[PDB]
Design a protein around this ligand. Structure first.
Ligand SMILES: Nc1ncnc2c1ncn2[C@@H]1O[C@H](COP(=O)(O)OP(=O)(O)OP(=O)(O)O)[C@@H](O)[C@H]1O
Ligand SMILES: [Mg+2]
Lengths: 125, 85, 243, 233, 134, 243, 109, 145
């Protein structure tokens, strides 16, 4: 039984560009407009919470999250995908650094490590 | 889509009609939609008809608020699916 | 080619067509429900449509008690609702075993939303066909109503509507909430919020209810239960004599 | 010809049928005639083997899985090996764990349960083989008719194969006759041989064309072939 | 010795909507005008699409022509000695209504020849030619 | 796009799964089988069609037994129901092994429904094409549930599937209306025979054969067994009396 | 199908208040049953509550079709007036056919 | 109304004239099939004859019942099971005009010609009432909007 979809769903188009990648870019360019800028003494990351229904609570939804007490994350795509990504990234960051090195990884290595998951998603069938 | 344009045209339509003194169009135009220059007059016509139904001969704020909910609901598109954004 | 719409793959407009079609499956039963948030408790009321006289009214219900403290109301085709109920009960079991304390509603809602997201991302899986409304009282946070969806977008609600007439009930409750400026009903007793919800539901749908047309779930402080038919008849009698 | 809904076995026709199973049943029909029948105390199988050319041989259309059971073939030869092996595994398991000879109905249930799991899951294909299980337990003589669809039923007699079902009428006319025949194996076998003869179209029965098996209390399961079958011709 | 009206499948695909139905109707009327006629609907793969729905109403005019043909072959009125021959290279994509007996009885199976068939083909196509004896 | 019915997990634009609908349509091409929920227990009934007289009478049976108190009667793809009842028996055996209490009927329903829907989530499994009228008696009382290939089950007071499904349900409604206070098993078996005879009128072209079985506390004290002896003949000629 | 309408024709100002006629809902269906089963020769305490419950998603003329089919069923036994248990058969028969129709979907404009 | 060529005086009235295709589709010779040539259809025959034929010969029973006779009966089914032969037998047994109609015949050339033809068909049916129209292969024009 298992998973019969062992084949990659991302196939090189004859034009030489990935389909699903250029499709996710389109899905990203529409949605919430977020931003973040870097200053000398700190970095500020901002996003707007589009309250879908006025009966909802934007407080419960966390548009920004805490990867580590030093590193935060802001997204502009699909909600649940970002939530799963942030949970997985927190888990793998803990596994890679808190378990082995004893502290919180820096931004440069954490970003590569979290992007590892996405660059595997476009590869794993 | 400009707030100033919708304000201007709403005031122009309201001036000829019988808006009550305790009725605010600014409360109606708080949200920025793609409202056309025609729907934002049929909405006031609907509000007037709603007031006439309740036998009031001067439209109140409570009918202007309800008019927005019946003449402009959605364009559907993808806003019905919040997870896209 | 044309195989995009069949599985959970992105589209020229950047859309997941299968997840979009999943929402249209939640309105098959055309059962309208709403849940309000009281000062100290929560009450969720759903239409109870019994199609055939051969049905036993007791067994037919779209309200499942997840645990002794967390209740859930689900809209859509029942078999998928029962699958979701089974998974939710098992996961509440696992969390209570592993962490030793009863879980809050938001954690359960987030976990089910994550499960639905895994369903959407994996191609060989299909998304859940239901919309789940998690309702409970959290001593750490307060009364709370949580509504997920087949995609996995969950968010707490002051008051939740559903069904074919979800928008109409939404505006009906929004007028009251925007005129009273309060985030919850000020009625302290769980008795009063039931009549409030029933009155608003009746005015919204424009229908009059009997003992069997509607099933009400009540979540008090550290207690969730489903009222029997006599309770609903007594509530309706009180509403009729009061107004 | 094949249609769009053929695909794999896990697919429903709009009418509500499985085309795979239907194709398996057609392949069952295309096979040779293997009419069999049973009495109160005896079970008789009659098989008509097929040869490719003059300088050829004949398929063992009668496969024995135990002393108290037997098999017949009406289709794809290689899958019959798998089915007979499974039946023998279960018979030996019954002998070694329960000491109870496998009940014929239980054997049919096991066979249908096996035949399902190819038609239920992707990657499998239905067993295009038709078994006529015979046997004798403490209850009495029994006979079954297995199909690739998983349908298994017990009958006094039947015939699966090319124009074999045209020989069912001979059994039906004499259904009231061979039932009341007990302890008379030779004449029951003769009636079976008359039954298959009705399904002949081009060539008659000979020594190398008739394969006959019979089981009972005094008569254990025995396969007749060669000169041993000419007496019943 | 009978009239042998030939019909290429693509010819029954006109531009304006419903013209294929008129095409087939007039063709069958002309065939019925004669005492004995043989029609050779050929490459019916063109107008042979199985009925299907896709939302956009794909190539529904060809479908209309095909159903007009099916009704003409066997409808509320007998055919009238109009023996009809079809021919195709992909019979799979034919609507099962056409395959139904009543409008198609025998299904020939022109297939690849065997060794004896190949020898007969060579003899037929080499009746001419200055082939060396032996 | 076309081909929305080729696969299983694909959603149609209106949100209705298509292979399940075809399985439902395959279910109706099966032998009729009814079940009556009498006051003390349940009474099943089947109309196994007698083919050419070569088939041995009173030997082929279709009322399969699970444990002692759960009975299964199935229509449609008979082998598929065979496998379904096999898995159900395994689940009941596991429950009795690790709880040492006989499986209650709603729990068996939950298990069977979860198994059934597990086969309509993937693309590599064909949905079941069998509808069951499984039921029986437990500690709390009696229950009669019909299972549908979509995975939805309901606590019916009586149900029937097959060629004469529509005719059978009308007589079920008439019986329920005639006896609102309840019904005894002894009269229930005769009524079931009458209902099957009325349903069989559609298939009068082929010969019939009736097999009936009931689980009850008053007589069978929670044991499931068929009807043998003079009782079956009495039901048969009572039902033939009104004809 | 209001969806396949030209937006220029659908503009508020050309087509004013867009009254929507929905499927009958519970109490509405009881009125339909009373109206369509008043000319028929009723011969019982016609409490349409069971028919109201079962006729879920029924749309107007369909209820009239249940009345017509009940009249037919009364004729099948040569009875000259419909019986309260013959309406039930007609309702069931019509409800079974309702599955043939596509699952009616529409968007409130 | 007929009218003179030059004085334009109304010389004489005329009966209503339908499209010439509509005149042809009316059946003239009754196809000899009878219900004895169709077999295996007993429920279907009884349902059809009691819904299209019975409320045409004994409509007084329905009028006494105060009930609306059904408009028409759909005859869906797999290809080649008698969906058309039953219509032939019904036309044989019935005693009213039995205009046949193939659905592709309705689809026509210019804008509105098909609508005019299908309106004239029902006008002719009303003229020679009662009638049984037999729109056949309905999926030719009955495709979803
Ligand atoms: N029950 C029956 N008794 C006798 N003949 C039958 C029966 N059913 C089908 N036939 C045969 O079917 C043929 C006509 O088929 P028919 O036109 O009814 O099929 P169809 O599928 O409805 O066709 P179409 O969709 O093209 O209108 C005749 O030759 C007729 O003899
Ligand atoms: Mg026909």
């Amino acid at each position: 039984m298992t998973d019969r979809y062992s084949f990659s769903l991302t196939t090189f188009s004859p034009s030489g560009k990935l389909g699903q990648i250029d499709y996710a870019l389109t899905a990203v360019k529409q949605g919430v407009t977020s931003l973040g800028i870097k200053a000398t003494n700190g970095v500020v990351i901002a996003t707007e919470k589009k309250s879908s229904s006025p009966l909802a609570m934007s407080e419960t939804l966390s548009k920004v999250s805490l990867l580590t007490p030093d590193i935060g994350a802001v997204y502009s795509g699909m909600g649940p995908d970002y939530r799963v990504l942030v949970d997985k990234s927190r888990k793998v960051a803990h596994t890679s650094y808190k378990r082995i090195y004893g502290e919180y990884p820096p931004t440069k290595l954490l970003v590569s490590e979290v992007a590892k998951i996405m660059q595997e998603a476009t590869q794993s069938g | 889509r400009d707030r100033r344009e919708r304000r201007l045209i709403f005031g122009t339509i309201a001036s000829k009609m019988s808006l009550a003194p305790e009725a605010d169009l600014d409360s109606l135009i708080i949200r920025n939609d793609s409202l056309s220059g025609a729907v934002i007059a049929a909405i006031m016509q609907e509000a007037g008809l709603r007031a006439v139904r309740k036998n009031r001969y001067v439209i109140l704020q409570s009918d202007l608020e309800e008019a927005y909910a019946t003449q402009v609901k959605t364009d559907n598109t993808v806003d019905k699916f919040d997870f896209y954004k | 080619a044309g195989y995009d719409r069949h599985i959970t793959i992105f589209s020229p407009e950047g859309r997941l067509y299968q997840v979009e079609y999943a929402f249209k499956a939640t309105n098959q039963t055309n059962i309208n429900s709403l849940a309000v948030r009281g000062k100290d408790c929560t009450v969720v009321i759903s239409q109870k449509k019994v199609p055939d006289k051969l049905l036993d009214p007791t067994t037919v219900s779209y309200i499942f008690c997840i645990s002794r403290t967390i209740g859930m109301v689900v809209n859509g085709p029942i078999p998928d609702a029962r699958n979701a109920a089974l998974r939710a009960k098992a996961e509440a079991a696992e969390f209570r075993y592993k962490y030793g304390y009863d879980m809050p509603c938001d954690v359960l809602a987030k976990r089910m939303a994550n499960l639905s997201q895994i369903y959407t991302q994996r191609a060989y899986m299909r998304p859940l066909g239901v919309i789940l409304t998690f309702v409970s009282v959290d001593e750490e946070l307060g009364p709370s109503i949580y509504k997920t969806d087949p995609a996995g977008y969950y968010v707490g609600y002051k008051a939740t509507a559903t069904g074919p007439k979800q928008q109409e009930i939404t505006t009906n409750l929004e007028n009251h909430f925007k005129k009273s400026k309060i985030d919850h009903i000020n009625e302290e007793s769980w008795e009063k919020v039931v009549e409030f919800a029933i009155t608003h539901m009746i005015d919204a749908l424009g229908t009059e209810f009997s003992k069997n047309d509607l099933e009400v779930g009540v979540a008090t402080k550290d207690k969730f239960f489903t009222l029997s038919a006599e309770n609903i008849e007594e509530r309706l009698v009180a509403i009729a004599e009061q107004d | 010809f094949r249609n769009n809904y053929d695909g794999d076995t896990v697919t429903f026709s709009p009418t509500g049928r499985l085309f795979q199973v239907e194709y398996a049943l057609e392949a069952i029909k295309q096979g040779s005639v293997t009419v069999g029948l049973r009495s109160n105390t005896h079970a008789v199988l009659v098989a008509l083997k097929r040869n490719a050319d003059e300088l050829s041989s004949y398929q063992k259309k009668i496969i024995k899985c135990d002393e108290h059971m037997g098999l017949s073939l009406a289709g794809l030869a290689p899958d019959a090996r798998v089915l007979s092996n499974y039946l023998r595994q279960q018979c030996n398991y019954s002998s070694l764990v329960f000491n109870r000879k496998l009940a014929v109905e239980r054997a049919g249930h096991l066979l249908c349960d096996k035949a399902q799991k190819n038609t239920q899951s992707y990657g499998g294909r239905p067993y295009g083989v038709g078994l006529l299980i015979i046997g004798y337990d403490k209850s009495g003589a029994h006979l079954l008719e297995f199909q690739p669809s998983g349908n298994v039923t017990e009958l006094y007699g039947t015939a699966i194969g090319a124009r074999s079902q045209g020989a069912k009428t001979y059994l039906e006319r004499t259904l009231d006759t061979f039932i009341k025949i007990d302890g008379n194996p030779d004449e029951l076998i003769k009636a079976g041989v008359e039954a298959i003869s009705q399904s002949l179209r081009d060539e008659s029965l000979t020594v190398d064309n008739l394969s006959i098996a019979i089981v009972g209390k005094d008569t254990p399961f025995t396969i007749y072939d060669g000169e041993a079958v000419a007496k019943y011709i | 010795d009978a009239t042998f009206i030939r019909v290429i499948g693509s010819e029954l695909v006109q531009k304006y909507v419903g013209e294929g139905a008129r095409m087939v109707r007039e063709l069958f009327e002309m065939a019925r005008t004669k005492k004995a006629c043989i029609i050779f609907f050929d490459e019916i793969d063109a107008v042979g699409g199985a009925r299907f729905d896709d939302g956009a109403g794909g190539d529904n005019e060809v479908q209309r022509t095909m159903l007009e043909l099916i009704t003409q072959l066997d409808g509320f009125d007998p055919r009238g000695n109009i023996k009809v021959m079809f021919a195709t290279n992909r019979p799979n994509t034919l609507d099962p209504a056409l395959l139904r007996p009543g409008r198609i009885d025998r299904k020939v199976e022109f297939s690849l020849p065997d060794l004896e068939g190949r020898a007969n083909i060579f003899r037929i196509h080499s009746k001419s030619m200055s082939v060396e004896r032996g | 796009g076309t081909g929305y019915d080729l696969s299983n997990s694909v959603f149609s634009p209106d949100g209705r799964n298509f292979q399940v609908e075809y399985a439902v349509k395959a279910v109706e091409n099966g032998t009729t089988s009814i079940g009556i929920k009498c006051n003390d227990g349940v009474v099943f009934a089947v109309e196994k069609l007698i083919t050419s007289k070569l088939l041995v009478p009173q030997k082929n049976v279709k009322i399969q037994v699970v444990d002692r108190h759960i009975g299964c009667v199935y229509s449609g793809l008979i082998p598929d129901g065979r496998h379904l009842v096999n898995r159900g028996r395994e689940e009941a055996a596991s429950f009795k092994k690790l709880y040492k209490t006989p499986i209650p009927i709603p729990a068996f329903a939950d298990r069977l429904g979860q198994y059934v829907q597990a086969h309509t989530l993937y693309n590599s499994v064909r949905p079941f094409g069998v509808s069951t009228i499984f039921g029986g008696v437990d500690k709390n009382g009696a229950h009669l549930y019909m299972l549908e290939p979509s995975g939805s089950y309901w606590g019916y007071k009586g149900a029937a599937t097959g060629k004469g499904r529509q005719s059978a349900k009308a007589e079920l409604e008439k019986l329920v209306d005639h006896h609102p206070e309840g019904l005894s098993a002894r009269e229930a078996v005769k009524q079931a025979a009458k209902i099957i005879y009325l349903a069989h009128e559609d298939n009068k072209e082929k010969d019939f054969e009736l097999e009936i079985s009931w689980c009850s506390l008053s007589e069978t004290n929670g044991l499931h067994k068929f009807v043998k002896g003079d009782l079956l003949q009495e039901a048969i000629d009572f039902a033939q009396k009104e004809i | 199908r209001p969806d396949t309408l030209d937006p220029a024709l659908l503009r508020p100002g050309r087509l004013d208040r867009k009254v929507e006629i929905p499927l009958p809902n519970e109490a509405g269906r009881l009125e339909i049953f009373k109206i369509h089963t008043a000319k028929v020769k009723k011969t019982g305490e016609f409490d349409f509550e069971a028919a109201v419950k079962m006729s879920d998603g029924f749309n107007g003329a369909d209820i009239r079709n249940c009345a017509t089919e009940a009249g037919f069923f009364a004729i099948r036994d040569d009875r000259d007036h419909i019986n309260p248990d013959d309406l039930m058969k007609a309702v069931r028969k019509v409800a079974e056919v309702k599955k043939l129709e596509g699952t009616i979907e529409y968007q409130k404009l | 109304v007929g009218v003179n060529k030059d004085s334009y005086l109304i010389l004489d009235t005329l009966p209503s004239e339908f499209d010439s295709r509509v005149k042809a589709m009316e059946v003239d010779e009754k196809p000899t099939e009878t219900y004895s040539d169709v077999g295996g259809l007993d429920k279907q025959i009884e349902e059809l004859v009691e819904a299209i034929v019975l409320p045409m010969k004994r409509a007084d029973k329905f009028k006494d019942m105060g009930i609306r006779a059904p408009k028409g009966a759909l005859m869906y089914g797999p290809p080649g099971t008698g969906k058309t032969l039953l219509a032939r037998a019904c036309a044989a047994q019935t005693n009213a005009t039995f205009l046949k109609l193939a659905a592709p015949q309705l689809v026509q050339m210019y804008i509105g010609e098909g609508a005019k033809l299908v309106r004239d068909a029902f006008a002719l049916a009303k003229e020679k009432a009662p009638t049984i129209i037999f729109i056949d292969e309905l999926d030719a024009i009955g495709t979803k909007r």
